[PDB]
Each structure stands twice: as structure tokens, then as C-alpha cells.
Amino acid sequence: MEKSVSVILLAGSMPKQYIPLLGQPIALYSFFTFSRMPEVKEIVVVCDPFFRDIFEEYEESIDVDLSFAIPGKERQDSVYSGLQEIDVNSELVCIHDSARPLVNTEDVEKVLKDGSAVGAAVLGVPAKATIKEVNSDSLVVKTLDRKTLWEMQTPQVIKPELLKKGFELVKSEGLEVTDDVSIVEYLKHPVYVSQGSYTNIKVTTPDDLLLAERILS
Amino acid sequence: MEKSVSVILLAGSMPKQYIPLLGQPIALYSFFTFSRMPEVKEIVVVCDPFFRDIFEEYEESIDVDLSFAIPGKERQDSVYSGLQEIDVNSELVCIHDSARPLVNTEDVEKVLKDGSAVGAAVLGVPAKATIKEVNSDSLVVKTLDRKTLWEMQTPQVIKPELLKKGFELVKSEGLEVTDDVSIVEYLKHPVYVSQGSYTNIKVTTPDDLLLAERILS
Ligand SMILES: N#Cc1cnn2c(O)c(Cc3ccccc3)c(Cl)nc12
Ligand SMILES: N#Cc1cnn2c(O)c(Cc3ccccc3)c(Cl)nc12
Ligand SMILES: [Cu+2]
Ligand SMILES: [Cu+2]
Ligand SMILES: [Cu+2]
Ligand SMILES: [Cu+2]
Ligand SMILES: [Cu+2]
Ligand SMILES: [Cu+2]
Ligand SMILES: [Mg+2]
Ligand SMILES: [Mg+2]
Ligand code: NA
Ligand code: NA
Ligand SMILES: [Zn+2]
Ligand SMILES: [Zn+2]
């Protein structure tokens, strides 16, 4: 389990993931969280060359190998680029959106374990809002059961062979990728939802930055 | 269409819906929005007696009738209580969560029209997060299509007879009510989703209060 995990850290005015929270660019919070975990062998940072120095500065202080990959056009392209740089025998890849700086170590632990066990897992929390499918006539698609919808977060943790098979399938068949689990949806392999924390927010808007400071205290 | 609509305004440290935004308790923002609409004949405010004065102070300045109902145990109970106080021939009831102070008049207009036309409508916005059903083994219930999930907001607009039939059914059959459209889900009558605005937030946490000020400018 030690040094078995490769992290792909998605990090591609300043883009939101480089703005500081308490003086430290957002992307560094999750970077340091992962670096400290004995399970994590390497972090492949997917970022524009311009920002490489933000991470390279801490290279000799961290207990992981630091690598880079070039971002792609869409998120899944950035995932793929990162994937080409991971260690040839990492048992798991841990993909994380750098705009989620508050991910707790204990939650990363949990999703790593679940991904190892199941093959694929993702941190999720129950959706608090009422959420429904709406059809092409703008009508609610009704359901009769208390139904339980979950909001996916990151990390998304997967055996690299499984992820590679997913990309192979989507490219070979020309399949649509429209949300953050579309690739694994095309496979028959199960995907576990590890229960996360509502504090694991994504910083998308400058109002988020204030919520993120509020949480850090 | 003039004076055809009854609003049920759900308004049951200070509870969040009574905290000020720019000096005015949150619940008053949507109250005033509705009051100004010529379609709106009455607002039945569902609130603890303690807070009645917050609304009664403006009674002679507003061009609607102001009535009160006692809150119930759960949200649907508060809806029912309000429903017993609306005008005997309102053509539509417009149920609104007072913690949504930023609802725009043009959006209320839209959902009123759609509710009149269809019988039942609710303001919604596309969910930006990846959201999935999760089964009892904590696995993702996969879907193969680009799927479109919407977050419901308020107003929820409905012909009162339809709503009364929904309550009659749920009480007579002992049916579970677990989200904000459960009652209409038991009926066969269609429910329209009117496209709202991402600014129509619900103030649930004190960080919301800052987002709400930010939006008001
Ligand atoms: N962008 C993007 C994207 C679209 N689908 N997809 C996906 O299935 C995985 C792999 C995965 C999914 C769930 C749990 C673990 C791993 C990842 Cl990491 N990214 C994506
Ligand atoms: N609390 C609560 C609650 C549970 N179900 N339900 C419902 O179906 C309606 C009516 C309605 C639904 C959609 C569109 C318009 C009206 C309303 Cl107003 N409240 C609720
Ligand atoms: Cu190195
Ligand atoms: Cu190495
Ligand atoms: Cu946010
Ligand atoms: Cu009156
Ligand atoms: Cu009257
Ligand atoms: Cu919020
Ligand atoms: Mg398999
Ligand atoms: Mg009907
Ligand atoms: Na440099
Ligand atoms: Na009084
Ligand atoms: Zn550990
Ligand atoms: Zn009008």
C-alpha cells in the first residue's frame, strides 16, 4: 500500500486554482495533502508550463516524485495526458481537481481503500436539493420511491488498467463524454461511492474563496 | 390574470430567513417582489406568530391582502396550513421559500404562466455538478445517455385543486413525502420546469448571506 498510488492533480485575473487562500495558492493545499500520505508515490500535475514553478519550488521538501503533463482541451483530455505520465506499476490512480483544496486526508484514505477494493471509487455527498431529470418537453420525469442522489466530488480513484480500457473504448467507438464519470459508465465494472464531506467544495466563483477561508478556520 | 394568484410564503441567533440583507430581513425581499406583481392578490405568510409583525408593518403599503397561517412540523405541513387560507377562487397558488430572497420578477412571471398553462410548474436550473443515483451497495447507478438533471428552486406554482387532490391522496394512502415534489409525483398530471436563474439561491448557511449581498450589487 505504501507508494502504490499516483495522483493526477488537475490544475489546467489568475485562474481560480492559483489564487491564494491564507497566502497559499489553492492548488497547493491538495498537493500537500497528497504529498504527506505514505500511500502516494507521485503527483503528476497537469498544468500550463507557466505555473510549473508553483509546485517545483517544493519539490525537494515533499516525499513524492513530482511530474508534469500538458493540459488538454477538455477535462478528460487532461486526465489522459496525466495518465500517460504515471509510474508503470502504480496500483491506483487518484485524480483530483486542484480547485478542491479542502479535501481531508481521512476522506482521501477512504476513497483510496474503496478504489483498491472495488477497482473504481469516487468521493460523494448526498445532494441536499431536490433534483430531477427533465425531459425534452420540459417536464419532470417522476419517480415514486424516496430516491438517493449523490453529488460527486474528487478524488476519483481507479486502477489504471481499467481507466486505460475506458479511454480505449471511448476513442475506438467515438463515444460522448458529458460528465465526470461518463468513461466508467461505459464499462461493466462497478464504481463505488465513498462518503465524503460537505466541506470538500470546488472553488469556482470568487464567493467560494471566502467560504474556503471560513472553513480553514 | 390580474389578482388571480395566491402566494404561500414559507417563513417558518435569528432564523436565517429573518436575518437582514442590507438592513432588510431576508423574508421581506421575496414578499415585496410578489406584492408588486399585479397577478398576485394575496400572500399567506406561514410563520411563527412572533414574526408576524415583520410583515404586518407593511400591510397598508402593499397591494395585496396579507394573511397568516401557522407552520407545521414538516415543510409539506406548512404548505397545507397555508393552503387552507387562500382565497376560495384563486386560480393558482405560488409556494415560495422565504430563504430565496433574490427571485427575479421576470422568473416569477415565467413560472406563473407555465403553471397556469400546464397546471403545475417549478423554477429549475441545470445542475452543474455530476450527480448520480447510488444503490444500496453504494454503487453508482450508471446511465449511458447524456442526461439532464435540474435543481428545483421556488416558486412552485400549482392549480389549488390539483394540490388539494395531491394532499388527499397522500393522507388517504399514507404515502411518503421525501423531497419538494413528492406530492405531485404521485399524481399523473404533468409538472413543467420553468428555467430560472442561478442567482435564485437559498440562504441556508451564514456564508450564503454574503453571497446574497454580493448578488444584490
Ligand atoms: N473528465 C472526465 C471524465 C469523464 N469520465 N471520467 C471517468 O470515468 C473517470 C474515471 C473514474 C470515474 C469514477 C470513479 C473513479 C474513476 C475520470 Cl478520472 N474522469 C472522467
Ligand atoms: N414540502 C413539500 C412538498 C412535497 N411535495 N410537494 C409538492 O408536490 C408541491 C406542489 C408542486 C410541485 C411541483 C410544482 C408545483 C407544485 C409542493 Cl408546493 N410542496 C411539496
Ligand atoms: Cu522527482
Ligand atoms: Cu519513482
Ligand atoms: Cu460554490
Ligand atoms: Cu388584508
Ligand atoms: Cu380579497
Ligand atoms: Cu449555498
Ligand atoms: Mg472488471
Ligand atoms: Mg390532470
Ligand atoms: Na521558471
Ligand atoms: Na406585535
Ligand atoms: Zn494511510
Ligand atoms: Zn405581470
UniProtKB/Swiss-Prot annotation, chains A, B:
Gene induction: Circadian-regulated with a peak in the late period of the light phase.
GO BP field: isopentenyl diphosphate biosynthetic process, methylerythritol 4-phosphate pathway
This protein's GO CC annotations: chloroplast; chloroplast stroma
Feature type site, description Positions MEP for the nucleophilic attack: 146, 202
Enzyme class, spelled out: transferase
Pathway: Isoprenoid biosynthesis; isopentenyl diphosphate biosynthesis via DXP pathway; isopentenyl diphosphate from 1-deoxy-D-xylulose 5-phosphate: step 2/6
Tissue specificity note: Expressed in leaves, stems and flowers, but not in roots.
Subcellular location: Plastid, Chloroplast stroma
E.C. number: 2.7.7.60
Family classification: Belongs to the IspD/TarI cytidylyltransferase family. IspD subfamily.
Full protein name: 2-C-methyl-D-erythritol 4-phosphate cytidylyltransferase, chloroplastic
Organism lineage: Eukaryota, Viridiplantae, Streptophyta, Embryophyta, Tracheophyta
